[PDB]
Amino acid sequence: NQLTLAVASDQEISAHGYPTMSDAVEHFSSSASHGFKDCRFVAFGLQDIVIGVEPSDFVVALEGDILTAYIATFGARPRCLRGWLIPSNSNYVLEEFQVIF
Amino acid sequence: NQLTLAVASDQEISAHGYPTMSDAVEHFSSSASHGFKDCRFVAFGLQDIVIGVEPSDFVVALEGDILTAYIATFGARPRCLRGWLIPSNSNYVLEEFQVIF
């Protein structure tokens, strides 16, 4: 539930998603157990900073107002979408979040 | 891992989805445990049949070549997307699929 995430703090970041949903639950379960030390939070309003992730690529989406995390394409647009967790090594600032998995 | 699904066969498919991941999980979870009988399979390419479902609405998506099913917005477009299961009372024909979750 309580997570201190690495929020992207570069003007542009190099990132990547995954091609299929099965590669994503494979890859993101390791992240989820390692507190996402490898991912960066990108706010919905800052999506343009992300390079290397196509609309078809799977990332971790966050929705809510308390956030619910789930695997989704980067191009998907549900209401209440607040941001994504995206594999990246960008520079970051640590921020506390409340996340449901 | 071996499912009989109601494949939509009407000219127009009146249907609906769900506005948040949390709400979608609840319904589809009950729909899954009742064999998806309240749902219709809509092949990719026939989404213009569907009335009542917004791109932001959550439905069940099915991707693969053997399918894997997961909750996703109706508008999401991963590679190998084969179709959706969407709550609908449309006329149907029964067909055989292979599905994991």
Numbering used by the authors:
A (entry chain B), B (entry chain A): 3 to 67, 69 to 104
Sentences from the paper on this structure:
Similar to β-CoV nsp1, α-CoV nsp1 has been identified as an important virulence factor that acts by inhibiting the host protein synthesis function. Here, we are the first to report a 1.8-Å full-length crystal structure for FIPV nsp1 and a 2.1-Å full-length crystal structure of SADS-CoV nsp1. The crystal structures of SADS-CoV nsp1 and FIPV nsp1 reveal that their monomers contain six antiparallel β-strands and two α-helices. The overall structure of α-CoVs nsp1 shared the same fold, with a characteristic six-stranded β-barrel formed by β1 relative to β6, β2 relative to β5, and β3 relative to β4.
As a newly discovered CoV, SADS-CoV broke out in 2017 in Guangdong Province, causing the death of approximately 25,000 piglets within a few months. The SADS-CoV nsp1 and FIPV nsp1 structures were refined to 2.1- and 1.8-Å resolutions, respectively. Their space groups are P212121 and C121, respectively. Each asymmetric unit of SADS-CoV nsp1 and the FIPV nap1 structures contained two and four subunits, respectively. With the exception of the regions encompassing amino acids 105 to 110 of SADS-CoV nsp1 and 106 to 110 of FIPV nsp1, all the residues of both nsp1 proteins can be built using the final models. Similarly, structure comparison showed that the overall structure of SADS-CoV nsp1 is conserved relative to that of PEDV nsp1 (with an RMSD of 0.84 Å), but it has several differences relative to TGEV nsp1 (with an RMSD of 1.89 Å). For SADS-CoV nsp1 and PEDV nsp1, the length of the β6 is significantly shorter in SADS-CoV nsp1. Additionally, there are also substantial differences in the loops, especially those located at residues 11 to 22 in SADS-CoV nsp1. Furthermore, the structures of α-CoV 1A nsp1s and α-CoV 1B nsp1s also exhibit obvious differences in some loops, especially those located at residues 52 to 59 in SADS-CoV nsp1. Specifically, SADS-CoV nsp1 and PEDV nsp1 have a wider distribution of negative charges on the surface than FIPV nsp1 and TGEV nsp1.
